[PDB]
Amino acid sequence: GNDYEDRYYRENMYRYPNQVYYRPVC
Numbered sequence: 001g002n003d004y005e006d007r008y009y010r011e012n013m014y015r016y017p018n019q020v021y022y023r024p025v026c
Contacts, residue, residue, distance in 0.1 A: 018025060 017023070
């Protein structure tokens with residue numbers, strides 16, 4: 001719907017190989 005939710009989520013790439021999260025995020 002909204003490009004913020006859309007981009008919110010498209011940000012799921014941050015959910016992907018998150019630059020350190022090695023995925024766990026901690």
